[PDB]
């Protein structure tokens, strides 16, 4: 029962489409700009006490490719973030896997609980490293 | 007497059309991954208030920029040390806008008098041995002898003797001999030097144990080590 | 002085210069390998080819080599002539037939003159399908690694080492396409100026072994203009840093002092910066225990005890900067400031200063030394202390051959003709030391004696 | 369903002899527009260049694939796998043990050292492709 | 060749300029832009400009107006002495010719007279030039900052201004609190536009997010710059090859359409003519992305002013186009597949069957779209005469695309100035009956979508044979199989991906027909491996500038319908 306020802007909300004072989830997507950052900070303030924030895309996780004068280098500089979903743009399946990775936090409570120390980098490690062969890219 | 040092380099307000001189080439890599193992949040770039240079690649290193301090040479199509030709006025000449550095003093109008302090001729003494200084490019300098690559390029510590003086002492090449400087004792293996005149003793200056102040000193005692 | 016509345009150049050094000064890109500004022109690589016409109306001329061609008044040349461009591409193609597939694992990569000239000619397509020649390598000591497969036979290494630097243990061996550049047998390169071979060689045959332990490419380096700290000559250097450690030492051109060359103590003696034993924080003692302080704590702690002291003295250093000694002198006062060198070393240094400032005799710069006609060296074992002066003195001793060749109207850049005219004739050089020096091979007389006898 | 050329997770691959394919040439790091690769060259006693550390910041990565096309050994490749997600941005920083997989990936047969002139164990001078045996200068044959 | 350097002295506009102002009153630059470039003095700017407006075949449209820094430009042979410059690109539709006027400036006296009286579209262009450079346009009514906020000190496209965010101090939220307080106190000082005035001042914020201040319609003032990513500045800090991903994100629906003008412009600096297979492949990917963008515009247009239940099937068709793009290029959006001299790989071996399945699949859906939109009455009744404009309004405001074609001005870039081998295809240019409104623009797009499918039919049946990359030393990167085996090819690949390819000092310029309007790239090389100046002309900037002229005399509902009908995206607008 999670209510999502999607603030996806340009070129990252087109994947989300394929996929106030009422939401408990803020899915920040798109490039966060210096000029428009008070809008996201006020929308974050308006929400109620149990907030959750999902950052998706490289432009929201970091500055991404735009290490430039007009772009803030990540939404985590000014708002707390719970889940980070890399990509440019991420996939709808990744959005699904973000909500699945977040219900575990909602059911695990300071919500670290000494159980969130396990990370997908180390958890799926023995899956990923044992891979030997991949399809040749001259075919469809 | 140190008034010229102001003009050796410009100050930290010097700009090439508003730009600070760059330290890094424009294709410098890893800006968002160099320090990412400590903190994934990129730190601010170091700020230089002392000099005209910036701790970044966002600056100027043009070959035709009006400056004398060139940090490195690079030109389009010239990535090698041959890119220094673009920074010179004529190739093999001077830097285009002048070489960096200024002479503190100019030649004086009048000279000196003749020094009349002629030394007497050298005479060997029994017991006292004059220390003849020997220098090495890879051992005699204080900072660079602590480089690990210089440990093998430097020679073994030795003591160089005239053949007639080693015959009077009774030693040959390779014999460890003991001597006394200032109440201390150092043992070194003997080497034989035909061009070294008698009454002298060759020591390697600036090593671990042999100070360069020892040049022109005297060794009171010299005998075979036991 | 002279006016030449290049590719339809017209330029003013020095008549004594050859066409390669004339056109490179104007910003006209001609590829080259075997020519060097310091070493002169020999004409080996044939890469600098241009088409020369007899006059403005001659439409079909001939290919000459611009390093070997004088820039006389009335010269008509074309760099961008189609036949010249095809030939210059072919020279790169002939050098590419035996070159190993080594650029990812070559330390010269990104800083390679052969890589730059290959792109500049525009040769990118291989036609040669046959086998490549290979060579085994030598051990050249702790400073320089050896990879003869990358050699393009430009002869720059031997011309620097024997002719310019007067080293004796590097030569060329073999014949035809099997020519080998190196030592007669494995062992350390004996010259004090061996490390300039890494800049002089346009490929990755001679590379820095001290840099290949912690290797990084040139684009990842952070550079600053610096001065060598290993002796008093003051060679200009360009130190490069990656990941907080000093990586290599490069020569920084200065036409008054060092120009293209450094000594081996300057080039390879930088490793003390990268020591793990260096202090990184201020440290204060408490009996046997040691306390780590920050900058603010250290200043407040030191000045509390310094306020209670009745006299503070300061000991400077000759290896400290002028701003560092003066600040020390400002803190204790000039009556309490000591230089840190012994009295006898102090007495020789101020007398050396007195003759430079008050002697009335001009003191030459390091490159101005090469123009002098006689050299007397009294007491200073100059190859071991002040090594770049010994390199500059070797060039001064070769001025006799340049004077004979000038009388016979041989150009200054035609180095093999000048060396043939010379035939061991030297400007007189008289050295005095307590033993033999490394300048003894070129010295007119050596005097081995104690210092009072010198 | 993903096509073979899909630009998801970045891995480092291995040789058919089983060694890591990366020779730490730093071309992938410089060709990246975002600057998301850091690495340092190390060298074995055999003489084989290999990376001491390999670090990709996947928070910054845009999956453009310019690193894969820059690589002259086919070591770095982009795989069809988009399944990534973390609670901490620090856990998006991948080291070499998170990137080096057990096989050769998309290009099963290419070995760079077989091409290269440089001598390592198993390949002395003249044991590379289109390479003749070394002839000494002291050889009797002219 | 079509890339060689030309002075364009045989163009008939220069001779009548010689006979009007004399030979000493201007200076002609030899470029690779394809157009004459003339340096005029700022005291003659208005006289020369109004002279070209009443030529017997006059120049009617100001394509672009922006500035260059030029202080660090070393190769400046033939140009007058300039410390800053302002260029004016003008277009005559009746001659099918362009002219560029360049005004030189000194560093102490950044002043030039405003061009707004002659061409109304110059108002936003001069504000951007005032924002990004420090050129002051004398006589401008409201010359304020259009990209950066109003307290931003510094002109970011000056060469002394540091490009990277890391070079400044990070988001410590010292300025976030002040910007939050300023945004919270949103009040009108009567400075945000003309603002003559009883009157209710309302800010309404809605395919992109932007703010507009409307008077309740008596006066409306767009506030843009919320999506500024510094793309133009980014061209100065990236090599020619590594800049290519940034091109894909100027327009999200564009994809490979956006990469096309940039690679064609770089290929003019390189002097590369590409093979025919490269031309047909690039045209194929551009028409696939054009179909995807047009279906998005028709889909979203039907949803807001009508029942969205039947048209939701278009998502499956867009999924088929994205599956075909990521089968060819690799990734669904932002392919970054075009290369200098060619494309990144060859076509994979099963491409023909998938494209044939898409060409068989599409006509049934397309004829359902024609039935759903041409024959409908409710959306037609809500789209006829809703903020209409004609041919005179289009040419004044620099409106191109379906807008300009909905009037009688038949102007496509693929027919007037053929590029990428478009002249070897059989396709028609639809045109309206002289009135551009919301119904006419959508009907034109349905006709264009059918012509795009004809181009794809010829690409599948006349796909020629040969390379996917040109044989030229500046083709970046080289073919990889030759790189992996041959040393000279490896050497070229090494320096191209690391230091960069060296483009010789010139200026190139390409225009393409984009998915929405005309998109261009004006690139300047100073001889280095990076661009000295990169200018991106986006049509959405002109289309969004045109809306206060047409909406004046309408309701808020008419504003929402007009904004939904125009071909504007805010990533294009702010770049
Ligand atoms: S992360 Fe990538 S896709 Fe998303 S907004 Fe940024 S550039 Fe566009
Ligand atoms: S010497 Fe130059 S061309 Fe040869 S392998 Fe090394 S970098 Fe490549
Ligand atoms: S070793 Fe180097 S400098 Fe000597 S000939 Fe070969 S390529 Fe030239
Ligand atoms: S001569 Fe050698 S040690 Fe002295 S400053 Fe020059 S490089 Fe350094
Ligand atoms: S991954 Fe490839 S390009 Fe990157 S360092 Fe390793 S070998 Fe070089
Ligand atoms: S995919 Fe692109 S952004 Fe990611 S590491 Fe490779 S080059 Fe960098
Ligand atoms: S550089 Fe002139 S022939 Fe070699």
Author numbering:
A (entry chain B): 53 to 71, 90 to 179, 190 to 220
B (entry chain G): 682 to 907
C (entry chain G): 1 to 454
D (entry chain I): 39 to 180
E (entry chain D): 9 to 205, 210 to 218, 224 to 233, 238 to 596
Q: What do the authors report?
A:
Respiratory complex I is a multi-subunit membrane protein complex that reversibly couples NADH oxidation and ubiquinone reduction with proton translocation against transmembrane potential. Complex I from all characterized species contains homologues of 14 core subunits; seven subunits each assemble into peripheral and membrane arms, joined at their tips and form the complex with a characteristic L-shape. The peripheral arm, exposed to the cytoplasm in bacteria or the mitochondrial matrix in eukaryotes, contains binding sites for NADH, ubiquinone, and flavin mononucleotide (FMN) as well as eight or nine iron-sulfur clusters, seven of which connect the NADH and ubiquinone-binding sites enabling rapid electron transfer. Here, we describe the single particle cryo-electron microscopy (cryo-EM) structure of the entire catalytically active E. coli complex I reconstituted into lipid nanodiscs.
Micrograph analysis, in contrast to mass photometry, revealed that large fraction of the particles corresponds to the peripheral arm only that may have dissociated during cryo-EM sample preparation. These yielded 3D reconstruction to 2.8 Å resolution, similar to the map of the peripheral arm of intact complex I. Joining two subsets and applying density modification improved resolution of the peripheral arm to 2.1 Å. At an average resolution of 2.1 Å with the local resolution in the core reaching 2.0 Å conformations of most side chains in the peripheral arm, positions of ions, and multiple water molecules were resolved unambiguously. The relative positions of all redox centers with FMN and nine iron-sulfur clusters, including off path cluster N7, are particularly well conserved. A distinctive feature of the E. coli peripheral arm is the presence of ordered C-terminal extensions in subunits NuoB, NuoI, and NuoF with a length of 22–45 residues and a large 94 residue insertion loop in subunit NuoG, referred to as the G-loop. Similarly, the G-loop fills a crevice between NuoCD, NuoI, and NuoG subunits and together with the extensions increase the interaction surface between the electron acceptor module (NuoEFG) and connecting module (NuoICDB) by a factor of three (from 1400 to 4600 Å2), thus stabilizing the peripheral arm assembly. A strong density near the NuoG surface coordinated by GAsp617, GGln632, GGlu647, GAsp731 and four water molecules was assigned to a Ca2+ ion. Divalent ions are known to increase both the activity and stability of E. coli complex I. One of the calcium ligands, GAsp731, is part of the G-loop, suggesting that Ca2+ stabilizes the fold of the G-loop and consequently, the peripheral arm. At 2.1 Å resolution, 1170 water molecules associated with the peripheral arm were modeled. In E. coli complex I, cluster N1a can be reduced by NADH due to its uniquely high potential (~ −0.3 V), differentiating it from other characterized species in which N1a cannot be reduced by NADH.
